[model samples]
Target: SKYIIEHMEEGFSEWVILEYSQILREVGAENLILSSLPESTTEKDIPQRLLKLGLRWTTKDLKGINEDFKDLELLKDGRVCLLDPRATIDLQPEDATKFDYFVFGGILGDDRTKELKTAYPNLLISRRLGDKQMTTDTAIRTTQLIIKDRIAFEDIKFIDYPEFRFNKATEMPFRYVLDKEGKPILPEGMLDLIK
Candidate 1:
């Protein structure tokens, strides 16, 4: 299955690049597509490693989440799913075969007021990870575990509001998948960036 991230912010911030890198690691370059990027986005705007990954990207403003599927010529016959926390159903392993494309917002973190269901009324299939907020990369990883790894949504482990140490401990207001090491899975360079 292919993963598409609709860029929701104006510029490629460091945090965005880190998250995208994590997504590329999880899904690989061949299955990742970046859409709704700013027209000003150039090769220099992206990280060298991400550019090297050869992930597909476009600057065209695909207003809604599912609209990019149409422009990309990907089939939309009940095969597209949007990962929105507000959705009624939790994503399941069976959805791996049910969906061919998964679309996600490139927003940093959750904002209760930004109603995706209201904004994209045409989005047919929307699913939730859990009730709590998650970082974009965390969402992608959780979906990967469910779909690619064929793990049940309820079986997956998560760490909520993990506190990381720099000079002092900083608490993040998001949930993250717990790795086999029993530590929250974080993007590479995240701690360095926080420092």
Candidate 2:
């Protein structure tokens, strides 16, 4: 199964790039598909480090070209699932086999998945990770644990609205995966970026 992140934001900020990089590391380039990239996001606009990963992406929006893209048949085959906060059901381990493409909204703050629902009213399925909000990468990581590792979503640990100590304490309003040490699994350079 492939993980698809629809780039809904206008520009690739440093924070967004960090999340994308973490996702790339978690699910390799082979299984990662970045769609709906804005035309202004040229190769030169992206960081050299991230560009080296050779992540597959396109400016053509996923909603409009699902019929033409052969690999995205899941979008039309009733096998594509969108990770949404408004979903009534929680994602389960069994969903690993149930879906071929797991779609995530790459927007911050307000979600873009609602717009997707309007586009693929019948084809797109929705599921929630929990009531708490999560960063795009954290959401993907949690989904990976449930789908790929066959772990129950209820068993996964998370740190909600974690406070990070930079020069001053800053709180991030998102749920994040808790590591073995019980610390939040943050993206590389995130602390520095926060500072």
Candidate 3:
């Protein structure tokens, strides 16, 4: 038991931090936000810790990100600035109103974001690959993970290498599934979600 649990954190990079965030939807809402915050993290702390490991928490509010982005000293270094899930809606409250989960939806402590997005009529969504583990010790370890669990991705060719310019806040590779086969499902006239 101890060994298995140890591998989980130590082998984190292979785990997909975004995946960890996604599963937060499974936790009871009462504890979701608190739990998602990590053991000892504030806005500043999260970005700082992650930056040290070459990772960065995405922030939706560009202004907010800039404040911390400067402090991390990563801003000038050319690392991509990540935005939080809230940025999908951005400051435009109306854009946010079309979906659920308020300005942001994530592994917030105990909130089941998937369900909230479904139930709430006014929610905005910005998908990111979840819970990506940060380290596997070597490129080989990382390669094995992709081969073993492609997780429905086809062009993961880049992840095998220690590549750069990745946007953790980028939308997950999801398509409009109408009947499967990954075909275009949304009708031609489907209303623009921004409305």
Candidate 4:
């Protein structure tokens, strides 16, 4: 665990590790399938804290994986949805749970040509959350919100930071910002941590 973080690529590369950690820790379902994580990351890429999160998470490399796996329905079809903003088919609000396997970019910048675009056949479908380019971590969180029924498919929330070039606020409700009891979930004094 310590060794993997020590040997990880420096700079924005840290975001990759953090993104994987977020998917592992925060995602409610245990059905995580990592198709082609960065060539550098292997089973050893997981951090120790992530292992103890009790999410029952598992990252898999399904290059030649078997079609049947327990009661998981998605594994049978072996399909993947690469969440891209330019996708012609915007994911419908009612079809939020329609994904078999959700594939996200493991990198930190705009993926001009998505990996799944070249990997999958022409009939393969694609979906997007919004028009703006989002970080890998944020995309994972957005997926989680939809899966958990915490947010709508077409709704958008604009995060503000002075460092950002755009600071436009949307008209959508910040539903995930609070819990069912209406308590703050952003942690004490951490609301503006990104700023």
Off by over 4 Å in 3: 1-39, 42-53, 58-63, 70-111, 114-195
lDDT of 1 at 114: 38
lDDT of 3 by residue, 1-195 (tens): 000000112122312343333223222222112112333444564423233333434322222333644433212221221112222322222322222221233321212434433442332233332223222111111222233343222333223212222344232222222233533322222223212
lDDT of 2: 0.83
State which candidate has the highest TM-score: 2
Best by lDDT: 2
139, model 2: CA deviation in Å?
0.4
lDDT of each: 0.78, 0.83, 0.26, 0.46
CA RMSD for every model? 3.0, 2.1, 18.5, 7.7
Kindly indicate the candidate among 1 and 3 with the higher TM-score: 1
Could you tell which candidate, 2 or 3, scores higher by TM-score?
2
Candidate 2 error regions (>4 Å): 39-42, 64-74
Q: What does candidate 1's lDDT look like per residue over 1-195, in tens digits?
A: 778887888777889888898888878887888887887888787678788778677775335434544545544546778888888899999889888878788887634313544555564478889888888889889898899899998898988898887663788899989989999999998888877
In model 1, what are the clashing residue pairs, if there are any?
Answer: none
Predicted structure 3, TM vs. truth: 0.20
Report the backbone clash tally of model 1.
0
> TM-score of each candidate?
0.86, 0.90, 0.20, 0.59
Q: Write the per-residue lDDT of candidate 2 for residues 171-194, one digit (tens) a residue.
A: 999999999999999998898888
Residue 191, model 3, lDDT: 20
